[PDB]
Scaffold this active site. Sequence first.
Site, short mmCIF file in Angstrom:
data_model
loop_
_atom_site.label_atom_id
_atom_site.label_comp_id
_atom_site.label_asym_id
_atom_site.label_seq_id
_atom_site.Cartn_x
_atom_site.Cartn_y
_atom_site.Cartn_z
N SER A 267 -9.03 19.25 -53.41
CA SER A 267 -9.07 20.23 -54.11
C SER A 267 -10.04 20.26 -55.44
O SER A 267 -10.75 21.25 -55.54
CB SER A 267 -7.66 20.91 -54.83
OG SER A 267 -7.79 22.10 -55.80
N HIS A 295 -5.15 22.47 -47.91
CA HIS A 295 -6.19 23.45 -48.41
C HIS A 295 -7.14 24.09 -47.37
O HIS A 295 -7.62 25.00 -47.46
CB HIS A 295 -6.85 22.84 -49.34
CG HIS A 295 -6.35 22.93 -50.84
ND1 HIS A 295 -6.68 23.74 -51.57
CD2 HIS A 295 -5.71 22.09 -51.39
CE1 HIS A 295 -6.29 23.55 -52.68
NE2 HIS A 295 -5.49 22.67 -52.55
N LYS A 327 -0.85 28.11 -49.88
CA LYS A 327 -2.25 28.48 -50.22
C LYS A 327 -2.77 29.78 -49.57
O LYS A 327 -3.15 30.67 -50.15
CB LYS A 327 -3.18 27.36 -50.17
CG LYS A 327 -3.15 26.28 -51.04
CD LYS A 327 -1.94 25.51 -50.80
CE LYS A 327 -2.13 24.30 -52.13
NZ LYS A 327 -0.85 23.38 -52.06
#
Lengths: 491, 62, 153, 464, 44
Positions: A267, A295, A327
Site C-alpha cells: 500500500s 489490495h 478494500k
Amino acid sequence: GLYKRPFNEAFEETPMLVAVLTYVGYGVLTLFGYLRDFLRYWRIEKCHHATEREEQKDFVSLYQDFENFYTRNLYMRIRDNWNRPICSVPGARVDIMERQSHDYNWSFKYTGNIIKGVINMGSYNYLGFARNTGSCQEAAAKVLEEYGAGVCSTRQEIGNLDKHEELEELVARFLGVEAAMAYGMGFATNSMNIPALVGKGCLILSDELNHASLVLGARLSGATIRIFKHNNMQSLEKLLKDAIVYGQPRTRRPWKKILILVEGIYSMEGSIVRLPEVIALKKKYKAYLYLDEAHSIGALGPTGRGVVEYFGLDPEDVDVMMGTFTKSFGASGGYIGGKKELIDYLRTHSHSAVYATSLSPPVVEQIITSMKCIMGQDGTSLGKECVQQLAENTRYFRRRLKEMGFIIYGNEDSPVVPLMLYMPAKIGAFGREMLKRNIGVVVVGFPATPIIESRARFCLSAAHTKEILDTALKEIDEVGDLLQLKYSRHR
Amino acid sequence: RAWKQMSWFYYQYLLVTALYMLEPWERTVFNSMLVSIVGMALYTGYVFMPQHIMAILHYFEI
Amino acid sequence: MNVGTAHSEVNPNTRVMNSRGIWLSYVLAIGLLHIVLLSIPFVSVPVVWTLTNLIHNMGMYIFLHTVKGTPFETPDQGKARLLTHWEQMDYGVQFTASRKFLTITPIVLYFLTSFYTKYDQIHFVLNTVSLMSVLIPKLPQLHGVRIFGINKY
Amino acid sequence: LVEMVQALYEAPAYHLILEGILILWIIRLLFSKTYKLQERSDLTVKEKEELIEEWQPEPLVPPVPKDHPALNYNIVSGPPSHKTVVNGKECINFASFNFLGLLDNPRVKAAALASLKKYGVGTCGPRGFYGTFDVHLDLEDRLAKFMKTEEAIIYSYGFATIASAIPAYSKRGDIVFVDRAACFAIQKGLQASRSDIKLFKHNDMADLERLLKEQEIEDQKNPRKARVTRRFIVVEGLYMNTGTICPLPELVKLKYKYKARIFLEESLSFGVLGEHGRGVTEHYGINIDDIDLISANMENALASIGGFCCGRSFVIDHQRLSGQGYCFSASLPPLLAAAAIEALNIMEENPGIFAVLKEKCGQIHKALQGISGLKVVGESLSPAFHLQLEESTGSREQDVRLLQEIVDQCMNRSIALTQARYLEKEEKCLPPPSIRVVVTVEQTEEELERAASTIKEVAQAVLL
Amino acid sequence: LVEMVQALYEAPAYHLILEGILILWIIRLLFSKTYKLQERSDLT
C-alpha cells in the site's frame, strides 16, 4: 519466469539538498523537544497529560517516558491531520465534521458546522461499492431483517450458518481454487492462521515491507524469520540457498518447511510483487507460498481476480491465498483460499474457528451480492465497467502527476499513488492546505517510513470521474507550486 | 508585490527549518539566536578579516 | 506516526545512520559549530579549535553512548530498552562503513586541532582526554558493559 | 621500589611510551587464549546442488484422520435464536451465548437498519484516517457512561481486544501473575508480550501470595532492577472454562499490599452480573477505580460484533497508538455500532432482566443436580456452566465420544446442546471435555425443567 | 608539504608517537572488514 507484458517500476532517488534540509529540520525538532521536556519536568510549564492516581504514586511507573518522546514533541504538533471524523458514506465525496483546538492539538473541541463535498482520496474504495443505496444494500437489509445483527457463538459449536457456507463456496468459485474459508477480520486471518501452518523448526522468509498482521502471525509461531530486501529476487535466491544448504542455525538439521510471505500490492510503496520470478524460485527450491491479496483482489486484473490474473498465471501455483473484503468489496472480513486438504485442516486447527465469533449475516450478504455483481451473475455490465474505469483513472492520474514534475513511487498499474514530501513540516503543511481546498489525503511521517522518505498517499477509485480527477490534479499542482514539492529532475 | 514575495520567502524559511510546527515563542527564540549569531559573525568579519565581501556587496548594489 | 506502517523493521533506530546524506549533514554540522565558535571575537584560534573538539566530543558521548532506548515505542517489546544507540546500530554488527566513519572522524578532528594549537601541553591534555573518552566505548570488547554499574538502568 | 620509580621518572618520554606499549602488548598476549587454527574452507558448487537435491520438505498440512469430532460443523437453517433449526431438526437453543435476548428485538433491528440506510456496510479504512464515524465516538461515550468510567476504546473484533490490550502495557522484562484457567485470548495476549508469566492455582489466593512473596525476595535481591519492573495480575470476572467467579476484594488488597496492577476480563460478567449489569465489580461493590483495565466483548450480551476496553484516560489513551488491532485494521461497521448503542439503551431502560436471569440460572442449576454420570461444574449465578463425566474413562477421545452421543440424543429430542471445543495441542491447561449449558432470559420455566429431564434421561441411558 | 614536514619535525616526541599510534589504529580499522556478529551458542 517471464512477463507477458512489460513490468516497469520507478523509484526516483532523493535529491541531496532535500536530504540535508530534512536532517536540519529533524535536528531542530529534537533539540526543541529536549527543551520542551526539560521545561515540563521542572514544572515551569504546565503539563496537559493525565497523571497516575495518588494511591498508586509508589507503584512502578506504567510507561517509560522516553518511548513517548516523538508522540509529545513531533506527533502532537500535527495530530489534527489523522483522526478526522466523517458523517456520511465514504464515497467519492465525504462529509467531515470540522474540529478546532486552542491548546495546540492536545485537546479538540467540535464546532457545529460540517464540511461538505470533500473529495475522498483516503478511503480504500477501489470499485465504488461503498454506496448507501443499491442492490447490495437491499440484500443486506433483507438479511438483517431475517437473521439479525450478529451471531452469538463460534463456527465449531453452533455459530455455523448456511450463509457462511454459501459465501465460502462463492469465494472458492471466484478465486478459482478448490476451497476457501472465511473469517470476520483481515488482521485476525493472518494472526490466527500463520501460527497453525508453521511452527518450531520451520523457516519464514518475510518481505521487507510486510504488513503488521503478517509479522505478528509470524512471531506468534515459533518459526525462524529471515527478512529479504523489497522485491529483490537475488536476495531471495541467496536466503533460500543458504537456508537449504546450511540448515538450522545451532544444530545442522534440514528445515521442516520454508514459507515465503508476500503481498500483491504494497500500500505505501505501490509496487506490485514480481510474482512470476518468486513462483519460479518457489518451484525450483520446493518452498511454500503465502500471498496476501488484500489490495489487489479487486483493484488488479482485467476481471478483478488478483495478481494471478493480472500476470496471467495459474492460481494452483500459489499454495495459500489470503484476502480481505474490506478494500474492494465494501464490507469487513477476510478469507483464505487453497486446496481442499488445506481448508479442512484450517477448519479443524485454526484459532479463529475454535475460539472466535463468526461473521455477521448482513456483511456476508453484502459480500455475496458484490461478488456476484463483479462476476456478471446479475447479468448487467456493471462488473466490467468499474474495473476498466479504475484502470483508466489510475493511468490518467499517474501520467498527469508525473508530467507535472512530482516524484511518484511504484508501478504504473497500482491504483495507490504515493507522492513524496520529504520534509517533516511539509507533512502537516500539505495536509492542512489540501483540506483547505476540500481534498482529503493521508500523510505518513518518519517513525513509520525511512527517515528521508515522508509521503502522502492517494487511493484512487472507480467512483471518481474525469471532472473530479481534473479538480484534484489542479489543486495538487497549485499546492506543489506553493510548497515547492516538485523534486523530479527528469521532468 | 515585494512584500508578498518576502512573505513567501519567510513561509519557505519556516517550512524548510521546521519552524512551521513550533509555537510562536519557540520561533522567537530561534530567530533571536540566529540574528545574534549573524550579527556577531558580521562584527568579527569586519573587525578581524580584511574587507573583501564589501567590494562584492558594492558591486551587487551597483 | 505508528511504527511499522510503511516498513517491517522492529527498530528503525538501527538504520538511521545508514540513510542518504547523513554523513555530509553531520560534517556540515561540525563545520557550522566551528564557524559559530570562530565568530566569537575575544577567543583565539587555539581556543576555538579546542572548544570545537571538546564540544563535538561531548555531543557524541551524550548521544551515542549515554542516551539508551528509543524515542518511539517499538513493536519488538523493548528488546533494545537497555541499549545505547551505538550498540543498537546495525543490530550489534561490530564493523560497518557507518561505524568506521564515526570512529575515524574524531581522530581526524584531533589531528587538526593538535596541529592548529601548536602542540601546547594543556591543549594536548584536554584533547587527549576527550579523544580517549570518545574512542574507548567504540571498542568491540566494550559492549553492553557499564563500569561500576553506571548507566545500567 | 622508590628508587626504581625515580629512575623511571628521570628517563625520557618516548622510551617510556614504547615500554608502555610493550606492557599493553604483553597484557593482550596473556589473555589472548583464543587458539585460532588459521584455516578456511568452503563448499563446492556441485556439493551445494546435491545438498539442494537431498533436502525434502514436509507437506504443508498433515493428513487428517477424517474422524474428527469437529470435522462435522452444525448447520443452522436460519438465525441462531430461541426455537432454532439445526441439522434439519427443530430444537430449542441451549448453546448460543445470547443471555439477554437482544439479538431479535425489533428495536435493535430498527436501529441497525436506520444506520444501514445512512452509512452502508463498510467503513473502508482504519480509525487512524477516514474510518472514524460519529457512531463510533457515540458508542465509546455510551460505554464510558454506562460503566461509570472516564474512557473506553472499541475494537472491531472480540478476540483481538485483550490480545492487543495486554502487549501494549506488558513488555519484555516484566512479571505477570495470570490465573491457570484463563481463556485462549488472554493466553495469546500473554504470548505476544514477551514478559515473564507465572501461573497460580484457580481461585486460590495462597498461591498468589506465595508467588508475590517470592517476587518480593527477588526484589530485595537486586533493588535497581526491581525498580524498573512492572507487575500485573490478569484475571477474569466469570471464567469461561470453569464458570466460577473471581475473589475481587482479596485481589484488591493484594494489589495495594504488593504494588501490582490488575487487568480484569468481563466477557460473561459484563451483561449478567450486578444490579444494573456492570460486571463482577458491581456484584461485589468494589469501586471501579481500583481496577486499571476492564476488557469485554459485545458479542455475548449485546449481540453485536466487536469488543471494548474501559478505564481511565491515562491507561486507555495508550491503546489508541499502541494497540495493533486498533492501529492496523479497519474499524467496526456503523451497523453493529448502532445495534450496540440500542442494546445499551434497552439495558439501561429495564434492569429487571438481570434479576430474572439470576432466577432462571439458580433454578436450572439446582434442578440439574442428581445425575449419576454427570457433575455440574460451575456456580449458581453464571448463565453458562458445564456438565462433566464424574468417573472419567481412560482416554479423552472416548469421553468426547460419550458426550457427543449424549448431545446427539438430546438434539433428537428437541434440545440443542453443544460441547466445549479446545485446541488440544495449544491450550496451556487443557480442561476436561464437558457439555455446555447456557441460560437465557427467553427460556420459559417449562422448557427449563424439560431440558433438565431430557438431559437426565439421556445421561442415565448412555452412561449405564 | 615542506612546511608541514618542518612543523611536524619541530613538534615534540610523545605527541608524534601518539599520532603515529592513531594512524596505525586507522589503518587497522580500514582493513578490518571482518564483520563479526559477537554471538556464541552451544548444544545441550
